Write a protein that binds this ligand. Structure first.
Ligand SMILES: Nc1ncnc2c1ncn2[C@@H]1O[C@H](COP(=O)(O)OP(=O)(O)OP(O)(O)=S)[C@@H](O)[C@H]1O
Ligand SMILES: Nc1ncnc2c1ncn2[C@@H]1O[C@H](COP(=O)(O)OP(=O)(O)OP(O)(O)=S)[C@@H](O)[C@H]1O
Ligand SMILES: Nc1ncnc2c1ncn2[C@@H]1O[C@H](COP(=O)(O)OP(=O)(O)OP(O)(O)=S)[C@@H](O)[C@H]1O
Ligand SMILES: Nc1ncnc2c1ncn2[C@@H]1O[C@H](COP(=O)(O)OP(=O)(O)OP(O)(O)=S)[C@@H](O)[C@H]1O
Ligand SMILES: Nc1ncnc2c1ncn2[C@@H]1O[C@H](COP(=O)(O)OP(=O)(O)OP(O)(O)=S)[C@@H](O)[C@H]1O
Lengths: 730, 390, 384
């Protein structure tokens, strides 16, 4: 037969001889494809342009049919990871002679620091076909150089990744260049290393120790008593970069690589679905060392506790259990599982012996965000125009609550900011020379949102601090409780303390209260959350706490964050004894979640209600509602700024409407009462004349005769007793 | 769409891969489906259509196998655009109890294929949904849907531009010049998300022809114009999409039939009629019309009669709630009706909601009444004036 | 899961005798580790038959399988440590010391601890300032029965099974409960609060059996009940109907633990009415512990605990004066004073470990204290 499935294996001999481009595939496949042992063949990934490799006939008795052997440079050109599938094709065009070939090095070393140019001709003389991107290492060093590497950056094309050419020693023009990157015009890929990943350096070091040793030195653990650990349990919140870490291991480790991502093993036939797992493992054990990569294992390995698990899925997870333990290898094969839900892993998988090594893919903090953002601009330094160690820190610090995925989108949106500006200034301007400045990132900041906030939808009209007048005491506390913990986190560590996470706001009707939260949604520097209570309550039993858990789950990942609880009195259960069925469990869940974020987390709880005395005494325990702030009614000074808040656009300065006269007459006015007077008086002016240019005093006079007081004297008395309630005088 | 599929060199200079993944969310009738057709016909790229459960098969793995082969076609034929109509139908949030093993693999395929490396090349995926919060949060991370665009309800300005094109598409049977009537028709259409705007054009043809054939039923049907009165008759008989769920008799009430109460009638026009006719006045003054009025007095007065005529002679929508009708025995349904009704009110904005006997639903909260009334009122206080301007 | 097996296969005539395997204690830990490391033998040469005792005492609550996982991660700590200094270092000559084993616990999650999702931020007796009288009573009622359980069998004195804490908000309560297990204690387990009701009917009912399925873990397991309001807040004395059956299951599985067994019921609460008229039976809760407000002496030690980093004496602040003036503060209310005072001090001008007496005064005027620390009108005679 002529199977269409093939695998890649490195050449048995690595000596930079005549096998630089000639590769042995199969004695019979070439005959079945009418390919002579030495003719032209096209090899590449499915759906991608192949690489013109030289076909050769090997030993049919020893070489398996499904195995394809390549050279030491073919896999480096297209980043062909070992074990990837291949699509054999043919080339029917005699390649044009290479007029110019470029010689470069990835390590930043000039080619003059390598062997003599006469040796260079001998290095690549029998290759026959040369395409850009050929990387060959382990070359002889004339001097005491640590390591050298030569990459053909460019050379000078139907369904071909790189332009085919025929090299000719003694008649090919050779130019020496210092290029260290693959050509961008050819859109060549780049290998990924450990330093290519920013922020998560600590997890990489643990991973490298637990991967390199079993693959290359399996006898160390065997001579050390216990067998080396088998199975890697890689878990992390979404957006941290779990998928790339498995690729990084594949791109770093030099061994057979097999990837099992998604439900790719599910087959219509009953026996075919379970047979796929056995075939993959048998291939891995046949060419050890090898690595098996599993992504989203929880999607194919149900926890089996719930009743939604199917019979087919239960057999799939059981196959790994019966095969992980039942192998004769000492641990040369390493299995890595990637998932985002620690609790969704199968209980049998979590048992010892299956996932011995558990690695948490941490969310980058402020310090880590500086590291990742700095490295991202390294690969785009040609058109960077970004300050070093100064602009990156400012951008990284302001990216509170980021998980890592939003940073790539933010940088991508930074380019889009220049596109709108670049094309707006000139429709035919050159967009390749555009550079991202500080303002572009700030503009892209509002157009890039955290992933945790995608499930929260609130209008939140833009209300600033200026919308609140005469509340310096309220403004005094907010800056200390929000800015100080993050802007001066080292001071807290110097004192070894954490700022209190509780505040019990209370204000008369018409004051800010909720309006301050709109300013918090405007001037906080971090993510803001609000609850439209009592929507958390649900008809079904047990969903009242689950609704809180789901909303509070985002807070941990997006820590630090601020959650606003409007009208928290309804959240607290009623003690009158009416309808006390499910609200009692709500109180217990809220208290327990407060204590659960004490490990130097940035979770902040903000509450405001009109009935401070109707809440349970548990919320008055320190650590839940620490500060009792009396945001009282606006006074004369406050209403002076309140008038300028909404009547700044009004032309009261020219004639009429004296702010000082209103301030004396508006004693006891809340923030809403002052606004109500403007709405009532303004309607008088509009009816008098459709075109309004100024407002007279008589407009307010008619309004004043029909406005009541929304702050009763008893309302103030309720809060004063609440403010001083622990024995009053005592 | 253009740049990721037509300018491959631009992203080569930068060290960031081209963005991929477009998801559209919003209320129905905004025109999400039409935008998908416009992109497919305009852009010269491969188009893949997934209309609901168009890839779901009775076999265990056929549904997942279909996605892999379809996405491989996009990889093989680039540039390609993939359209998944109602992507939320096949990609639930995976948190509800109804989701089982069937929905687990189908959503997991999207995570695998659209990780940013499985497809690559010049493949872009554009999707739409009606409930953004019902989709899998794992799909909303960057690398699958980087940018999400919300298609909101068109305002007066947006409706006028849309309505102008529909009437001016033919330009032969327009019968109106300088857009004086078109702006007038657009200004009098409130809450017309665009589907009703198309329905307004459809019903405009319905109003005519019958009038033309009424006098004499023998004329050319291709020689009949559309007049201003036809659209006026067409707009009154069309209810807003949010109002299509309301089943009320609504007896006709006229203000001239109400004797006296001049003071009450004086302040009503300043609330609804004035903002509609004096929109430019509020922009100059930077103020907003009051939206809260309490009516009280001895029994036997007009009272409820005032609110009936609001839907008749104001030019905006109107939602009617029978006071304590929102009450329900279950905990999660007592205040749910408060948010559900106002969700339709926001959809049918502008609209007026009238409450009967608000005293029962608004206890004094001083230590009396029942918790259920307290639970409702606390919801009422937040929704009327809370974190939302309304 | 012997309970998950069909009871038909567990009836007499199929398995007359069954053995429940418990968590190995400290005595068994040395024997397990000695034979597990007997394969290592003199290759470590750091054992001396005393190093395991330190490891066994620190490695508490391990089911036993994770002990081998400790060895696997111990090899991870070495080799890489040797290769860190020299690239071509001989890995065979490298040896594992005490530092490598101790550092291994950082990247080790025990299988038993993974199931019992708890935080427990390492609370010791240093943080529990004052309450010297409280500690003595708890030790005589908890420490001695647990440590001298075999002695109590011969003595015949009935153990005071059933411990409940009631007092003003802000006291230790849960703080003292989790601190005892830290200093050579036993396994501590507590509920998360929202566990009585989960979703369907019967899924939470069988979860009660799963909670008590482990029963005695090592010597023995303790199932604390924090926030007892979550179990039975209502539907007992009024509006019972047919929804109080969940409380029945939680009360029928607590009388089968005998008296001198070590399995007791410990709970923390604040409202005596939430105790309900069902735990006052002779054998559920016979002795009552009232954790009242701390006295002046307790606040003196608490103040030093919350002013350890602050210079205090260098700035010229008297600690005795602060403790006397902090009267009426109940537990956590004393601690919160520094945090509010700390924020004011920092905002003045780049405060670096410089707190004066005025900082305490400023925060003293903006913190509320407990109100009515007399509980729900009944705290001594538990009879209504
Ligand atoms: N060094 C890095 N550290 C962190 N994130 C990175 C790094 N380099 C790139 N990224 C970005 O991190 C994101 C990781 O891909 P995602 O699609 O967010 O994975 P994911 O959303 O977590 O999917 P799951 O959780 O595996 S199902 C991408 O947007 C990358 O561009
Ligand atoms: N300085 C100000 N402070 C407060 N409100 C102001 C101020 N200036 C104008 N206002 C207006 O007053 C309104 C008061 O509304 P809210 O603050 O939401 O009421 P509240 O004080 O939160 O009491 P509730 O929510 O009914 S318990 C704001 O929405 C503004 O429109
Ligand atoms: N120029 C236009 N501007 C806006 N809408 C238009 C225009 N021309 C036509 N339409 C209408 O826009 C609508 C587009 O359909 P959609 O509103 O996207 O369907 P839908 O109601 O959203 O259903 P789903 O669930 O989204 S598939 C059609 O009713 C068209 O008649
Ligand atoms: N000048 C008028 N003012 C008010 N109602 C009038 C007048 N002339 C006729 N009516 C009719 O009288 C009816 C009185 O009904 P309502 O005013 O709604 O009852 P009500 O007095 O408000 O008692 P309630 O609101 O149900 S407690 C109106 O619905 C009209 O049909
Ligand atoms: N030695 C101490 N004395 C008093 N309070 C302390 C001490 N050490 C810490 N605290 C504080 O006590 C708080 C815990 O108080 P708790 O009484 O446990 O709260 P609670 O309201 O009783 O809820 P539970 O029962 O613990 S879930 C911690 O957040 C500390 O701020």
């Amino acid at each position: 037969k002529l199977p269409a499935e093939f695998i890649t294996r490195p050449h048995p001999s690595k000596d930079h001889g005549k096998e630089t481009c000639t590769a042995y595939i199969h004695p019979n496949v070439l005959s079945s494809l009418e390919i002579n042992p030495g003719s032209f063949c096209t090899v590449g990934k499915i759906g991608e342009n192949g690489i013109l490799v030289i076909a050769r006939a090997g030993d049919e008795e020893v070489h398996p049919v499904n195995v394809i052997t390549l050279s030491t440079t073919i896999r480096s050109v297209g980043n062909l990871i070992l074990g990837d599938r291949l699509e054999l094709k043919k080339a029917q065009v005699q390649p044009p002679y290479a007029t110019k070939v470029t010689v470069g090095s990835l390590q930043g070393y000039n080619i003059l620091e390598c062997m003599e140019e006469k040796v260079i001709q001998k290095l690549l003389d029998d290759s026959g076909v040369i395409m850009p991107g050929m990387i060959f290492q382990n070359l002889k060093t004339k001097a005491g150089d640590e390591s050298i590497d030569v990459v053909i950056t460019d050379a000078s094309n139907l369904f071909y990744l790189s332009p085919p050419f025929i090299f000719r020693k003694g008649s090919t023009h050779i130019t020496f260049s210092k290029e260290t990157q693959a050509n961008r015009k050819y859109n060549l890929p780049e290998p990924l290393s450990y330093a290519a990943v920013g922020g998560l350096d600590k997890e990489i070091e643990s991973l490298k120790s637990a991967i390199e040793i079993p693959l290359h030195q399996p006898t160390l653990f065997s001579s050390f008593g216990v067998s080396p650990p088998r199975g890697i349990l890689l878990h992390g919140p979404p957006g941290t970069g779990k998928t790339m870490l498995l690729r990084v291991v594949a791109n770093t480790s030099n061994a057979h690589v097999l990837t099992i991502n998604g439900p790719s093993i599910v087959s219509k036939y009953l026996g075919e679905t379970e047979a796929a797992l056995r075939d993959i493992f048998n291939e891995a054990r046949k060419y050890q060392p090898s690595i098996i990569f599993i992504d989203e294992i929880d999607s194919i390995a149900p926890n089996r506790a719930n009743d939604d698990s199917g019979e087919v899925e239960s057999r799939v997870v059981a196959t790994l259990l019966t095969l992980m333990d039942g192998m004769g290898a000492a641990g040369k094969v390493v299995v890595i599982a990637a998932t985002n839900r620690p609790n969704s892993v199968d209980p049998a998988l979590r048992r010892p012996g299956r996932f011995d090594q558990e690695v948490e893919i941490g969310i980058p903090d402020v310090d880590a965000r500086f590291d990742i953002l700095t490295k991202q601009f390294s690969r785009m330094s040609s058109d960077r125009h970004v300050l070093d160690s100064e602009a990156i820190k400012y951008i990284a610090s302001k990216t509170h609550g980021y998980v890592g995925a939003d940073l790539t989108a933010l940088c991508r949106e930074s380019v889009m900011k220049t596109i709108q500006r670049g094309l707006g200034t000139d429709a035919n301007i050159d967009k390749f020379s555009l550079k991202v400045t500080l303002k572009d990132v700030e503009s892209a900041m509002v157009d890039i949102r955290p992933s945790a906030m995608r499930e929260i939808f609130l209008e939140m009209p833009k209300v600033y601090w200026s919308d609140i007048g005469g509340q310096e005491e309220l403004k005094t506390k907010m800056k200390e409780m929000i800015q100080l913990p993050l802007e001066a986190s080292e001071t807290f560590a110097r004192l070894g303390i954490s700022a209190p996470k509780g505040v019990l706001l209370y204000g008369p009707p018409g004051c800010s209260k909720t309006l301050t939260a709109k300013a918090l949604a405007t001037e906080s520097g971090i993510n803001f959350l609000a609850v439209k209570g009592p929507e958390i309550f649900n008809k079904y039993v047990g969903e009242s706490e689950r609704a809180i858990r789901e909303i509070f789950r985002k807070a941990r990942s997006a820590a630090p964050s601020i959650i606003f609880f409007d009208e928290i009195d309804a959240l607290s259960p009623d003690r009158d004894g009416s309808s006390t069925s499910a609200a009692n469990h709500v109180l217990t869940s809220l208290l327990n979640e407060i204590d659960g974020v004490e490990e130097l987390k940035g979770v902040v709880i903000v509450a405001a209600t009109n009935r401070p005395d109707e809440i349970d005494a548990a919320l008055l325990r320190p650590g839940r509602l620490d500060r009792h702030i009396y945001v009282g009614p606006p006074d004369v000074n406050a209403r002076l700024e309140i008038l300028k808040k909404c009547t700044k656009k009004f032309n009261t300065e020219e004639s009429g409407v004296d702010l000082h006269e209103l301030a004396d007459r508006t004693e006891g006015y809340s923030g809403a009462e002052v606004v109500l007077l403007c709405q009532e008086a303004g309607l008088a002016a509009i009816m008098e004349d459709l075109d309004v240019a100024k407002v007279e005093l008589r407009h307010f006079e008619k309004a004043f005769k029909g406005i009541a007081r929304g702050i009763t004297p008893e309302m103030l008395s309720y809060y004063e007793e609440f403010a001083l309630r622990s024995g009053s005088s005592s």
